[PDB]
Every structure is written in C-alpha cells, then in structure tokens.
Amino acid sequence: EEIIWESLSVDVGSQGNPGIVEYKGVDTKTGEVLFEREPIPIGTNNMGEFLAIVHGLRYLKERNSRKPIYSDSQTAIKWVKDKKAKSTLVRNEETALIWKLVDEAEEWLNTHTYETPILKWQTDKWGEIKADYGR
RNA sequence: ACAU
DNA sequence: CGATGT
Ligand SMILES: [K+]
Ligand SMILES: [K+]
Ligand SMILES: [Mg+2]
Ligand SMILES: [Mg+2]
C-alpha cells in the first residue's frame, strides 16, 4: 500500500542483456546515491539485480542500519531469499568476473545474518524505482 | 502470465 | 524487436 520512505532502493543498468552491467543504491527519500558498482563487462540483468541487493545488505549491515531494501526484481528477490542465483549465463572467460562476484555474494549470504526486509517495489502503482537508470 |  | 528470469 504505502511506500516505506526510510529505505534503500537498488537497481541495475545494462548495455545489452547479456552485456555491460552496473548497479547502484540510493536513498529512497532523497535519491542520494549511496553506492555505485563499476561496470562489469558481461553479465545479465538478473545477476546485476542480485548483486545490487546483496551489496545493499552488506552496506546496511556495515552501518548498523535496519532500513529495508527495495528492488523491482521478482527474480533477484527470490534468489536472495534462496541464497542461490539461478542464472543461465554460460561460464566462460568473458563471464568469469560476473560469476566470481555472484559466487562471492552467495558465499557472503551463507556466512552472515541479517534482518533487513527485502521488499518489492510496486512499479505499477508507484512508478519507476528511485535507483532507476532511466535507460 | 508475472517481474525485469 | 531482442534477452533474463519465476
Ligand atoms: K532504465
Ligand atoms: K519471457
Ligand atoms: Mg530493476
Ligand atoms: Mg531500472
């Protein structure tokens, strides 16, 4: 029903899918950019959405923040819940970097705890997520 | 179908 | 129009 304004919103941006992937996290209320990942040469939209949520979890935990995270990605929200990114992207030399980051994000989830609620941003009711790249 |  | 996902 109501946006929880005291939250962190994340989104992926890409050039191609698969293609160059980046992501960022913003303060939902103000749009202040809180983190931005350097572009990764080849990845998928869903791998980027997953990495963005996990990075948000790590960012909030490090800062002792209980804020929830918004993502618009049904897929990535489930992958985080499962602690398993079920990506179809081939593993080869050009995808090694993204797969290393995904593997490491899963490993972090399997070795840390968090209470952070991971919430679906209701794009149909609220418009684009505040972290959107607008592309 | 839904979410990107 | 194409692709990534449940
Ligand atoms: K966009
Ligand atoms: K589809
Ligand atoms: Mg998104
Ligand atoms: Mg977006």
Enumerate residues with CB within 5 Å of ligand 4 (an ion). Answer: A 11, 132
Task: Give the integer Cα–Cα distance in Å for A131 and A80.
Answer: 19
User: Within chain A, where are the H helices?
Assistant: 45-62, 74-82, 96-109, 123-126
A26-to-A16, A18, A30, A42, A63 alpha-carbon distances in Å: 23, 24, 8, 23, 15
Q: Name the resolution in angstroms.
A: 1.4
Q: What backbone phi and psi angles, to 5 degrees, belong to A58? A: -70, -40
Domain A1-135: state its class: alpha beta
Q: How far is the CA of A108 from the centre of ligand 1 (A)?
A: 28
Task: Give the integer Cα–Cα distance in Å for A126 and A107.
Answer: 33
- How big is chain A by its Cα radius of gyration, in Å? 14
Helix (H) or strand (E) holding A8: strand A8-16
Enumerate residues with CB within 5 Å of ligand 3 (an ion). Answer: A 11, 72
CB A34 within 8 A of CB A64: no
Q: Is the N-terminal amide bond of A39 cis, ω within 30° of 0?
A: no
Shortest CA–C1' contact from A49: which nucleotide?
B4
